[PDB]
Structure 1
Amino acid sequence: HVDLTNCDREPIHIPGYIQPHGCLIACDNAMRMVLRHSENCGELLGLEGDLNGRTAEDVLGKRLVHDLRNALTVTTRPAMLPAMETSDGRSFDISLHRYKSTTIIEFEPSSDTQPLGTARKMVDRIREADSVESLISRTTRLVKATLGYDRVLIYRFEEDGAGKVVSEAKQPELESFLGQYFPASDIPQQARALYLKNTLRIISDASGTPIPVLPAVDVSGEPLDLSYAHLRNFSPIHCEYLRNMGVAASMSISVIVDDALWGLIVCHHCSPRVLSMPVRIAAAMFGEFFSMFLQVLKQKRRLDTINHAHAALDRFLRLAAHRANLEELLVDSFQDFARLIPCDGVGLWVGNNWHGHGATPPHDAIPRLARFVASVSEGRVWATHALSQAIPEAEIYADTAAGMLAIPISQVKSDYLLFFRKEIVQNLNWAGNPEKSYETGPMGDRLTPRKSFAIWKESVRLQAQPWSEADREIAETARIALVGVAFHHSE
């Protein structure tokens, strides 16, 4: 039994059911015996009675079982064998994998597509992208145009597991989710684990009748682990979510960057839709290449950002050599440091005087902030995205400054360069329809984009966009530059 109270701990990897667009035979480690089969094995393969306790060759044939064994010898990465013939001539696309010393064989009614042909075209059209923004924009349009889904989204995962819709291609009539966030809880840990293990996740029909796997549990009290099975059935919580959205079918492509789940390319259809194995092989290869190219572009962006910071700081050090009074130069220049680190406001606290630029806390609030920084900084870069958690009084000015990064600019005195960010809801660029409502099921309106967004908004109240690893790395380089030149000018 699963509901909104325990769906975070739902064992979605052992659901005991498969999707009706194919049938599944479980065999022992060596493909000698048939241990489990799907109820619909009879209909598709055209066999009669129980398949459990029979031998692999008896059910499939000496010819086919020979090919399956040889594919298995040349890891849990499933082998894809299109257009395989049974004993009685019938044609099937077959997914073959071994996991927990159990051989799983998945059967699909068989296509004349070239997997590498489709993929090469798609991969050529993204390979020449020169920015993350250009890669992400074109990929949704390209995937929508090639695979013909009603909506293609890209989610990027935030540090706190939350998802942001960073790109969208859709039918004109459908409502936009572009710039909308969902909370971490909308994709449980076990789901993220499976997204990390399988490139593709197919849902052919949300309204389809799930086919049970017999037996559900074996003699030793073990369920069949469907972690790597493409026919694995979906959570009824997600089923209701898609039904509430008017979504009948989905295909997710996992984006792996630096061996972490960066996000998903997700294709939604308003009517039932399953792609054939050859199209799924193409889409998987496209996914791998999309992931690799994004990785290199992310790396390039980082290098460019850090180089820009070094250039800007060298420019400043050149000026600092010529000016006699360093404090005068900082008072004149501090706003220019806003270029180094993305921020909504910057400030200088020097000789117990304050100078502000952009969205900063109010004048009266600063001496408090400066003392707090002095106490916790310990002559190192200090940063928080949640200022009110550190200073409850800061709650009052969170709309203007919810996050703060502090850079010490003197080894001796308690002088600081302060960077500020508004609370994240202030910087929202959401292209969705707020009047658009959603039909609900038994589980309630929790399973609607509208409530998902509302819950995320509540979870980031009085919080700013967190300071990235790059932001802190640049802050540290700036600290060393300013502390160094301050020492050269000291007496």
Structure 2
Amino acid sequence: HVDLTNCDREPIHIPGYIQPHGCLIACDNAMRMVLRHSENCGELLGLEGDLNGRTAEDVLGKRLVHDLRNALTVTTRPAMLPAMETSDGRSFDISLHRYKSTTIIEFEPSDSDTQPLGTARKMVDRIREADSVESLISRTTRLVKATLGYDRVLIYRFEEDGAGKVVSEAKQPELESFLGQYFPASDIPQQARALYLKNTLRIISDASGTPIPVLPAVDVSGEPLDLSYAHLRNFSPIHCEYLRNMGVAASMSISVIVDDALWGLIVCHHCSPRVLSMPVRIAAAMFGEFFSMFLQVLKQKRRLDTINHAHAALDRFLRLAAHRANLEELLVDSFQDFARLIPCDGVGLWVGNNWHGHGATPPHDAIPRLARFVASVSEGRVWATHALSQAIPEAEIYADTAAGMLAIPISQVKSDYLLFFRKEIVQNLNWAGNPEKSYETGPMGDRLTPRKSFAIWKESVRLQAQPWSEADREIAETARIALVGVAFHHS
């Protein structure tokens, strides 16, 4: 049994079922004896009786086994063997991998139509010239939808706290939009994120399809079959009910890997059953790999441009500070300009126990309390929180205006601070979805609906701002050194 209480620990890598669009044969390390097989091995390959115990050269035929063994030699990265001939002449696309000293063989009815390199080259050319992260993500959903013909294509970006944001969408006009919507970290368990990091590609042919059991589900020694790298691996019934509640019949997700971390997913949804042939899956995987590499470079360039711009801005200020006698007057005139360095909804100057504010800041009378707190915990270093009420309970009163704070000391001797503020994240939502869009539910309840996922997320981020990035804190530290530096020069 699995319900909304234990699905966080569901062992989705050992379900003991495959999807019905193919058949699976498990063999020993050196592919000699057949240890396990899918019930539907009969229907597809046309073999009567039990396959377990019988030898590899017997069940498939000496011809094919020679080719499979030779390919295995050339690593848990599965080997693709498209359009292979069996004993009785039937044609199959074969996926072959070795994991936990068990050899797994997956059979699909052959396609042998579309060329895998040809499709991929066309798609990769149309994204290689993107000059921004925004330009790459926007065009990719549109492109994938047009090429693989899925009803909806989304990109999810994973936030610092594991939550997912829908950052791009291409869909049929009649479907509802999820663009700018968030889902909580719990909507994709840790063990699911582990498998998504191990498999570039993940297929669901039919959410309402009947799953085929693996025989035996557990062997003599009491071990289950690990289908971690098997493309036919069946899907959690919790996620199954989710897709059915949405009217999604089929899916295909591509893993976006950046700096060896799971950045997010390209996710294709279809409203009717749909399986891509092996050749099309090879092309989509190759596209996924290139999409990942290009985004990584664009992120690097973006971070780099941002730091360059901060260095330039700080030089401009240091050149001004040389020709102004009174530094305090310059800071009072200039402080608002520092909002160009770090994304913020407001900025403020606390100098000589006087307060100057710009944009969304806490109220005037709240500032002396904050200044005392900052001086207490700062210790002449940059201090930042995205949850000010967790540090100062009375800061909850003004969370809608300032939920997040980053503090920069501007003096080595006196307790003067440049303060950057952010509104609570729910205030900055640019969500575009039908708020009165209902979802039919199943046994588990209305928890498995986009509407309730979004509601749970919104609750989780109450009184919290967008977290300060590594790039934000790196710029804050360079600004601290510039300001402390020039403050020292001016006696």
Aligned mates of 1:252, 1:86 — CA distance in 2:
31
Per-residue deviation at 1:193? 0.1
Per-residue deviation at 1:378? 0.4
Per-residue deviation at 1:390? 0.2
Aligned mates of 2:483, 2:322 — CA distance in 1:
12
Aligned mates of 1:364, 1:178 — CA distance in 2:
39
Aligned mates of 1:74, 1:399 — CA distance in 2:
59
Provide the residue aligned with 1:471 in structure 2.
Answer: 472
Per-residue deviation at 1:219? 0.2
Per-residue deviation at 1:291? 0.1
Matched, 1:53 2:53: yes
Aligned mates of 2:330, 2:126 — CA distance in 1:
49
Deviations 1:246-282 (A, max 9, x none): 0000000000000000000000000000000000000
Deviations 1:332-361 (A, max 9, x none): 000000000000000000000000000000
Per-residue deviation at 1:241? 0.1
Deviations 1:121-156 (A, max 9, x none): 000000000000000000000000000000000000
Provide the residue aligned with 1:99 in structure 2.
Answer: 99
Aligned mates of 2:275, 2:412 — CA distance in 1:
64
Aligned mates of 2:73, 2:346 — CA distance in 1:
60
Within-5 A mapping of 1:220-231: 220-231=221-232
Gaps of 5+ in 1: none
Aligned mates of 2:11, 2:183 — CA distance in 1:
22
Provide the residue aligned with 1:331 in structure 2.
Answer: 332
Aligned mates of 1:138, 1:384 — CA distance in 2:
35
Per-residue deviation at 1:466? 0.1
Aligned mates of 1:431, 1:45 — CA distance in 2:
49
Provide runs of 4+ in structure 1 moved above 4 Å.
Answer: none
Per-residue deviation at 1:167? 0.1
Matched, 1:356 2:357: yes
Give 3-state SS (helix, strand or coil) of 1:445's partner.
coil
Per-residue deviation at 1:113? 0.9
Per-residue deviation at 1:20? 0.1
Deviations 1:362-391 (A, max 9, x none): 000000000000000000000000000000
Per-residue deviation at 1:105? 0.2
Aligned mates of 1:25, 1:38 — CA distance in 2:
7
Aligned mates of 1:296, 1:436 — CA distance in 2:
39
Aligned mates of 2:133, 2:452 — CA distance in 1:
30
Deviations 1:288-336 (A, max 9, x none): 0000000000000000000000000000000000000000000000000
Aligned mates of 1:331, 1:433 — CA distance in 2:
46
Deviations 1:201-254 (A, max 9, x none): 000000000000000000000000000000000000000000000000000000
Give 3-state SS (helix, strand or coil) of 1:137's partner.
helix
Aligned mates of 2:184, 2:87 — CA distance in 1:
50
Within-5 A mapping of 1:9-48: 9-48=9-48
Aligned mates of 2:9, 2:25 — CA distance in 1:
27
Give 3-state SS (helix, strand or coil) of 1:268's partner.
strand
Aligned mates of 2:74, 2:332 — CA distance in 1:
67
Aligned mates of 2:483, 2:412 — CA distance in 1:
9
Give 3-state SS (helix, strand or coil) of 1:156's partner.
strand
Matched, 1:421 2:422: yes
TM-score, normalised via structure 1 length: 1.00
Give 3-state SS (helix, strand or coil) of 1:447's partner.
coil
Give 3-state SS (helix, strand or coil) of 1:222's partner.
coil
Deviations 1:8-55 (A, max 9, x none): 000000000000000000000000000000000000000010000000
Deviations 1:420-457 (A, max 9, x none): 00000000000111000100001000000000000000
Give 3-state SS (helix, strand or coil) of 1:98's partner.
strand
Deviations 1:79-124 (A, max 9, x none): 0110001011100000000000000000000031110000000000
Aligned mates of 1:451, 1:63 — CA distance in 2:
55
Aligned mates of 1:429, 1:192 — CA distance in 2:
27
Aligned mates of 1:437, 1:337 — CA distance in 2:
45
TM-score, normalised via structure 2 length: 1.00
The percent identity for this pair of structures is: 100
Deviations 1:443-488 (A, max 9, x none): 0000000000000000000000000000000000000000000000
Aligned mates of 2:137, 2:168 — CA distance in 1:
6
Aligned mates of 2:356, 2:210 — CA distance in 1:
66
Aligned mates of 1:279, 1:95 — CA distance in 2:
14
Aligned mates of 2:259, 2:121 — CA distance in 1:
24
Give 3-state SS (helix, strand or coil) of 1:92's partner.
strand
Give 3-state SS (helix, strand or coil) of 2:291's partner.
helix
Aligned mates of 1:66, 1:395 — CA distance in 2:
70
Provide the residue aligned with 2:141 in structure 1.
Answer: 140
Give 3-state SS (helix, strand or coil) of 1:389's partner.
helix
Aligned mates of 2:467, 2:103 — CA distance in 1:
45
Deviations 1:155-198 (A, max 9, x none): 00000000000000000000000000000000000000000000
Aligned mates of 1:74, 1:396 — CA distance in 2:
64
Gaps of 5+ in 2: none
Aligned mates of 1:149, 1:447 — CA distance in 2:
22
Give 3-state SS (helix, strand or coil) of 1:317's partner.
helix
Aligned mates of 1:396, 1:437 — CA distance in 2:
34
Aligned mates of 2:145, 2:203 — CA distance in 1:
16
Provide the residue aligned with 1:289 in structure 2.
Answer: 290
Aligned mates of 2:36, 2:452 — CA distance in 1:
40
Q: Calculate the aligned-residue CA RMSD, in Å.
A: 0.3
Matched, 1:409 2:406: no
Provide the residue aligned with 1:165 in structure 2.
Answer: 166
Matched, 1:254 2:255: yes
Aligned mates of 1:71, 1:466 — CA distance in 2:
48
Per-residue deviation at 1:405? 0.2
Aligned mates of 2:93, 2:83 — CA distance in 1:
5
Aligned mates of 1:205, 1:305 — CA distance in 2:
45
